[PDB]
Amino acid sequence: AQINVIGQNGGRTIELPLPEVNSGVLHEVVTWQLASRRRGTASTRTRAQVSKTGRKMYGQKGTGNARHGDRSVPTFVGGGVAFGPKPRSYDYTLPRQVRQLGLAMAIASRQEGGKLVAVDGFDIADAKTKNFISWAKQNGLDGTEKVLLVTDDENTRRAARNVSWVSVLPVAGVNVYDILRHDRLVIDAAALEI
Amino acid sequence: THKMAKRRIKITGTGKVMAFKSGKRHQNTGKSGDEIRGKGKGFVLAKAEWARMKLMLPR
Amino acid sequence: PRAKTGIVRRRRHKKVLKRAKGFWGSRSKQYRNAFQTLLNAATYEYRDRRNKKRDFRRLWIQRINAGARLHGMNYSTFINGLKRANIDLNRKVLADIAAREPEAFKALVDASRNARQ
Amino acid sequence: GSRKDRKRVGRGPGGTDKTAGRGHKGQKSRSGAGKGAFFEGGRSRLIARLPKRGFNNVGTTYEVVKLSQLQDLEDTTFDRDTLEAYRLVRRKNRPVKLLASGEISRAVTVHVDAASAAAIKAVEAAGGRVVLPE
Amino acid sequence: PSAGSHHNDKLHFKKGDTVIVLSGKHKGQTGKVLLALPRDQKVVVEGVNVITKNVKPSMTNPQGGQEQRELALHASKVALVDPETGKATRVRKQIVDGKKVRVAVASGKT
RNA sequence: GUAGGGGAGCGUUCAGUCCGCGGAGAAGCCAUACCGGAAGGAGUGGUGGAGCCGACUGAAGUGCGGAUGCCGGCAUGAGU
RNA sequence: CGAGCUGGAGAUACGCUUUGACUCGGGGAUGUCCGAAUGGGGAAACCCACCUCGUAAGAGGUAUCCGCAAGGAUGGGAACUCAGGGAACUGAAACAUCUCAGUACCUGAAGGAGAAGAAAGAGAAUUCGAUUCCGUUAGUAGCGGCGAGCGAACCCGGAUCAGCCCAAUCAAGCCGAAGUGGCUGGAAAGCUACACCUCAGAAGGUGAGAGUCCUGUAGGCGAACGAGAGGUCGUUGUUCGUGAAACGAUGACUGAAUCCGCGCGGACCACCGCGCAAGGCUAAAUACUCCCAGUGACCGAUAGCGCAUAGUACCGUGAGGGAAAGGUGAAAAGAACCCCGGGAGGGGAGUGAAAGAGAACCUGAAACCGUGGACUUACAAGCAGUCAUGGCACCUUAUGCGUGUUAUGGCGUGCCUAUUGAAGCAUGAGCCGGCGACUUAGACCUGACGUGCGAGCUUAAGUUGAAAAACGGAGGCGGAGC
Ligand SMILES: [Mg+2]
Ligand SMILES: [Mg+2]
Ligand SMILES: [Mg+2]
Ligand SMILES: [Mg+2]
Ligand SMILES: [Mg+2]
Ligand SMILES: [Mg+2]
Ligand SMILES: [Mg+2]
Ligand SMILES: [Mg+2]
Ligand SMILES: [Mg+2]
């Protein structure tokens, strides 16, 4: 039930998720997402096998005050680790219903406050990066917020490059994380929208 | 286990186990007539608990 | 990722150690022996904490019948005659009344006497 | 906001660490610590000694199609040979069979692979036809 | 290891150039480039120095003595800056030489 | 109250956010009579010289007095 | 590339560079001796020859194996592939079949990949149509002291998809936008006030914390030369253990047909299908990581590779085994000079923000050794503590319910483990650091809690975008039992 910033109207479509903004599902979603991103890289020599050591030692019974088999065991120094990390995945598929329920619930979570849909990007005028600051100031972005821009038109994205103000998300490749992370979501391009 | 399929560990619709009567099967008979038909249907649910696990996934 | 034990053990240990003060020799200095001193130390702590009350009981009594006897009665006789009078639920710590203030304790004695014969 | 984002409220508890616990020394005192040999089943205890053979086959099996399902709701779309996949028999792998469960009078014409006695004795008394492969 | 190779081990300045001190100490003081060391990023300007004593087992009746000599520097300085202070000069071009480039910011004189 | 089962939590590394602090000085180390029901946590003072708390969420090589345990260091036997 | 260079080298001297050095990308030219070592010998790196051209000095040749010869092979390679040979511990709670397992190891051949292949086939639709690989079918058919256990294939979804011939762009690099004042400070990159760039706020350097100071980053450009058959006997394979054992495969004896023919379809027969063996090659999709690049809820000096370089020291005749080891400072300004001492070592001076950084140079815990001080101790039987009171000393969470120490009284059988039972004259342990033990995996099984859809619920391989995730219904689970 929402306005467009330039040109047309619409966005009175899109029934938002019920109840409005359930944060549990949100948490589930993002957690899944970071978990998807998580890259297992494990530098561990677990086994007494991994590290380099010859394996027969010295006398068993009869040396006294001793008791050992080998130098590669985890009770030794320099040896293997008992239960260290190995190269795993931890990537799964969260059920798709929730995969699409989430981002909707995010956009919904942007209805307690500011969000925006745009058309007519010609106010950018190539890139120049300056006219993006302008466009923002005229469209109400102090740049004291954090902003995510979702649009096509490479000319239009590439106007925005900076840490302070904004971040860019092409071709409606949107992330529940990315939009929930930033303060303002500029939904911009009305393609995936409406 | 995978041997026990055709032999009766067999599972019912209530998730119970079919084990009936062994009393004499082949060798050593020549007592009565209904001990011979003493071969039954039957079960108990004590060792049925870990029984199915032999047969588990293949119902 | 790993978490080295660093500064965790050391902290705990330092705390145990600090609990040990006028502890003789090894006890006050190296960890293990300190800590395990502190186990038996616990035992004596709590138990003597329940105890010192039995102790002070003993002391006070030991004074009270002392004064009583100075006046010609005893703890048995004194509390017998005192409590025989519904007059005195007096009871607790009355020892210092025998110790510090003699005339009073004398009056309590004579009271215990009138409550006898 | 991710930082104001809450938990699941009771999805998971923390795991189980047997390090510490001040007087945990885990498992069973002797005998059955350290082993990977535990193994609940096995021929030892009262499974063998149990007397069966029979023989295994499990041949042709059929889709069970509830009568109650067919009648009552929908349109009587005249199920037949294709639409039926959308009617939730979904199998492939097997041919289809019709049996009698629910009772409502309806004119219905269905192509399945086989049916029961009171099934055909049902469908027709309410009027209809039930086809079988020739 | 490591060591001064953080830059491309190229020198923004030249051996015969007048150069001032960007920040650091002896702020904005200037002098001719004397020692230009590209690998270790070291610059000697006539400007800034110390008083360093010599340990001399044998030097001319050795009797060791003190000298006053020049302290070397990092990339911190400003290199040949014309309009009466230090500023960043990138731009290149040709003037009288086909085979040579030159340098400027707002101006074109180095 | 022992094996055992159930419940609440403390502390440590990493990660994402949040809030911030630091050469008028970070963490770490040192002492300390305060706080908390415990794991523990602050207040200030001394060291240090380049970095780091707090909050929420997530992941662990995550908590030692023992194993004639391992590497190291330093004692006793002794000025024998 | 355009001013330096003279290797890690710290060091003095000799010098080289704009007639382009140094460094970098590219070729060539030299390249002793040993090693497949190959003139012959040989205890590798040494010892002896011989033939040809000559001007000595010097150059070329002189092993064996298949060939007209041109020409090819000997050896090396972490792992990956195929092949000849092939264990045992272990499991079966003992042990022969069995399992471990065609696992380990030996050996042989080859390449960047291999193998495998163009149906005498799978298979039961008169479908499919070379091989490999992934998903799945599926722990299903089945194998088995029918024990422990082992365990397929077709269909279907994919990655990639060819059959073809024989014998009657990245490579060296150049270009590259945008800041000054004041302030704290030893030092500005921090604070502040105004200002700018951005297709460039990735990162590193710079005396501290960097868009605009250096190198870079987006973007753009960029070369001469260079790279892109049948049977019998003994057996075994695949789920195939002698089982009704088909079929492939050979070790030994045997030894047919050839198109009104031959092999198969799990004893065998007839029907009925599917196929046409005894000749070969054939990228791709698959495997691996010596090596280069990039990233990481990976380590950060007892970790991480054994190594912050060393297979070195060191051990062993040998095969083989095998260490620990990091930090001045921003910058050498690395301590002239003076004092005690042969020295080592320190005390001044000086440099420095700091020498509370001095080359036994970041911090600097603990054990452990001392120096000084406070209160104390030379008739007292002591798991070292605990409680109670008195003396004495001290008052930064701190003049109180204080802190330290003490004298006396009461009480008081280390810890852990193993136990019917431990102060035990039963195990363990010198003390303090630091290391050190319930984990991980699978489309597994079962339960508890939570979430999404809900009589429905979901995808896997893979495809496509990848600061981001969508697609992918093969299949799986409910839905009917006996
Ligand atoms: Mg035990
Ligand atoms: Mg002597
Ligand atoms: Mg002696
Ligand atoms: Mg003697
Ligand atoms: Mg006080
Ligand atoms: Mg213990
Ligand atoms: Mg017991
Ligand atoms: Mg003992
Ligand atoms: Mg003893």
Side-chain angles (χ1 to χ4, degrees):
Chain A
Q2 215 56 82
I3 42 166
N4 313 19
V5 84
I6 307 292
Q8 59 164 300
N9 198 82
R12 272 67 186 170
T13 333
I14 316 163
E15 312 172 342
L16 260 22
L18 304 176
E20 287 158 5
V21 198
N22 167 269
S23 108
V25 174
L26 262 57
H27 172 232
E28 181 156 33
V29 171
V30 274
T31 295
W32 161 77
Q33 201 148 49
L34 302 183
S36 63
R37 292 175 168 174
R38 200 176 72 90
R39 187 186 204 185
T41 46
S43 187
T44 260
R45 316 301 255 212
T46 295
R47 346 137 225 158
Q49 168 66 97
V50 214
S51 29
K52 215 191 284 181
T53 299
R55 312 204 251 275
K56 278 183 200 301
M57 197 170 189
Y58 64 82
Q60 180 160 21
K61 231 251 59 201
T63 15
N65 306 22
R67 235 195 186 286
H68 297 299
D70 183 16
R71 281 268 146 192
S72 74
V73 329
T75 92
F76 260 59
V77 145
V81 198
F83 311 135
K86 323 306 299 178
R88 57 182 189 175
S89 193
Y90 193 22
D91 166 276
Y92 55 117
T93 60
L94 185 64
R96 195 185 290 101
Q97 298 244 171
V98 206
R99 262 207 279 266
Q100 64 212 22
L101 194 166
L103 78 176
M105 212 164 238
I107 307 178
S109 313
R110 293 299 194 255
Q111 297 325 282
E112 298 85 62
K115 71 287 109 189
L116 189 147
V117 182
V119 211
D120 294 312
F122 184 77
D123 39 18
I124 288 300
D126 298 341
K128 274 301 181 182
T129 306
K130 198 172 195 188
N131 305 140
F132 190 99
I133 301 196
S134 178
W135 189 99
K137 179 170 295 183
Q138 309 301 324
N139 289 289
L141 304 170
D142 262 297
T144 322
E145 315 275 44
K146 280 187 158 301
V147 176
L148 178 47
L149 215 89
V150 193
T151 154
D152 296 28
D153 188 24
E154 139 79 357
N155 285 245
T156 224
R157 310 189 193 103
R158 99 173 193 278
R161 199 273 297 115
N162 55 255
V163 279
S164 214
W165 308 258
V166 301
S167 173
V168 176
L169 225 44
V171 210
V174 352
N175 222 38
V176 194
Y177 178 60
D178 284 328
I179 64 190
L180 196 28
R181 171 180 58 161
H182 292 53
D183 219 331
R184 297 292 249 273
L185 162 69
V186 166
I187 329 146
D188 210 76
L192 195 93
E193 200 67 288
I194 78 184
Chain B
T1 150
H2 196 285
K3 168 56 222 169
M4 312 333 172
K6 335 88 197 187
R7 183 190 296 174
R8 61 164 172 270
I9 197 85
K10 272 307 160 187
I11 296 192
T12 191
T14 335
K16 314 172 300 177
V17 170
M18 283 286 193
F20 318 153
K21 202 263 192 179
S22 53
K24 295 162 318 174
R25 204 178 81 111
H26 20 288
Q27 29 94 22
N28 271 75
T29 191
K31 236 70 57 168
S32 88
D34 262 271
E35 194 202 16
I36 308 173
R37 286 292 153 142
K39 301 299 301 177
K41 305 236 69 64
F43 61 102
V44 285
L45 285 168
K47 62 209 276 203
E49 190 161 335
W50 330 250
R52 10 198 182 183
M53 310 193 68
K54 277 307 96 197
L55 189 81
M56 181 73 222
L57 223 41
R59 301 156 75 176
Chain C
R2 103 142 165 266
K4 156 210 331 285
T5 54
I7 87 224
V8 197
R9 210 185 289 121
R10 225 213 333 280
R11 182 141 295 278
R12 158 219 293 148
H13 276 245
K14 272 287 319 304
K15 297 197 277 144
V16 166
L17 235 316
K18 184 198 175 290
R19 189 186 288 245
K21 20 204 92 290
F23 280 17
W24 192 108
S26 175
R27 320 236 141 176
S28 72
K29 304 303 265 56
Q30 37 173 273
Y31 175 80
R32 337 234 303 275
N33 207 72
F35 170 26
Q36 101 175 162
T37 305
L38 286 170
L39 302 218
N40 273 143
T43 294
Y44 304 131
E45 248 167 48
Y46 164 72
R47 301 197 174 172
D48 276 272
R49 182 197 289 129
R50 303 298 221 168
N51 270 65
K52 41 194 173 192
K53 313 206 208 301
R54 322 178 181 176
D55 288 39
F56 264 110
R57 263 170 185 163
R58 244 180 174 254
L59 183 268
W60 296 328
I61 306 196
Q62 212 158 176
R63 314 187 154 182
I64 292 185
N65 66 338
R69 283 165 157 81
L70 180 36
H71 295 343
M73 311 172 63
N74 62 79
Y75 186 86
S76 193
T77 298
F78 186 70
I79 317 289
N80 182 16
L82 236 65
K83 128 258 171 176
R84 189 71 82 189
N86 192 74
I87 307 179
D88 307 70
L89 33 151
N90 206 7
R91 304 303 100 127
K92 21 119 186 59
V93 197
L94 180 151
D96 84 303
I97 321 187
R100 298 203 223 134
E101 236 82 313
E103 296 80 308
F105 191 82
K106 148 68 199 152
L108 283 196
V109 161
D110 213 314
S112 204
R113 293 191 104 83
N114 293 27
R116 237 161 164 77
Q117 297 181 11
Chain D
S2 301
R3 75 102 159 103
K4 190 69 179 176
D5 207 14
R6 308 176 298 104
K7 60 189 59 205
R8 259 268 101 263
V9 201
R11 159 236 50 189
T16 36
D17 281 349
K18 331 298 208 299
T19 71
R22 42 66 194 106
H24 282 107
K25 318 179 283 165
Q27 284 156 320
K28 159 179 188 44
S29 250
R30 298 298 165 89
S31 87
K35 322 174 179 189
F38 309 147
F39 227 163
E40 252 280 7
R43 87 95 179 63
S44 196
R45 301 139 263 148
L46 272 149
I47 310 178
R49 104 189 280 226
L50 228 78
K52 188 78 126 283
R53 269 139 82 172
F55 74 106
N56 171 246
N57 201 80
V58 198
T60 320
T61 314
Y62 290 79
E63 287 70 294
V64 185
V65 180
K66 196 180 183 190
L67 206 70
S68 113
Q69 186 187 154
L70 221 177
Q71 276 163 353
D72 198 292
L73 280 173
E74 215 213 347
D75 291 23
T76 297
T77 325
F78 338 117
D79 326 309
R80 294 160 190 171
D81 64 327
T82 302
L83 326 174
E84 36 182 14
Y86 243 180
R87 300 192 296 93
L88 300 66
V89 296
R90 52 181 163 188
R91 285 303 314 167
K92 316 175 179 180
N93 200 190
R94 292 163 188 173
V96 197
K97 176 126 70 167
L98 187 70
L99 323 178
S101 300
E103 313 163 11
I104 150 181
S105 188
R106 204 170 190 179
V108 284
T109 291
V110 205
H111 304 355
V112 310
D113 297 283
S116 45
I120 45 181
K121 196 80 161 184
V123 167
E124 296 171 347
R129 199 183 195 100
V130 165
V131 117
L132 313 164
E134 299 162 324
Chain E
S2 31
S5 325
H6 299 272
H7 297 16
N8 205 119
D9 290 283
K10 298 192 294 183
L11 293 190
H12 63 59
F13 62 91
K14 199 202 279 280
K15 84 289 181 180
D17 295 30
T18 292
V19 165
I20 85 173
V21 166
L22 204 180
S23 82
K25 207 253 172 171
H26 287 257
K27 302 155 188 177
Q29 286 179 215
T30 181
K32 171 185 52 180
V33 169
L34 294 164
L35 223 199
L37 293 166
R39 278 179 289 183
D40 316 285
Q41 230 70 2
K42 284 269 179 178
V43 180
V44 175
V45 74
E46 272 202 31
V48 193
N49 91 108
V50 271
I51 304 228
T52 104
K53 26 218 164 278
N54 222 341
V55 166
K56 276 300 187 171
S58 294
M59 244 244 312
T60 313
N61 252 76
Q63 200 217 346
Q66 287 188 335
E67 282 189 342
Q68 200 176 145
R69 293 147 131 270
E70 322 261 356
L71 66 88
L73 300 170
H74 295 180
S76 53
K77 57 181 219 170
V78 209
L80 240 189
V81 277
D82 203 279
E84 308 190 2
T85 16
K87 64 178 171 177
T89 103
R90 289 205 199 193
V91 191
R92 52 89 212 170
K93 49 190 178 182
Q94 143 170 190
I95 306 190
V96 296
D97 197 320
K99 203 181 177 178
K100 284 254 76 175
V101 301
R102 268 187 49 88
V103 261
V105 190
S107 310
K109 307 87 189 277
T110 67

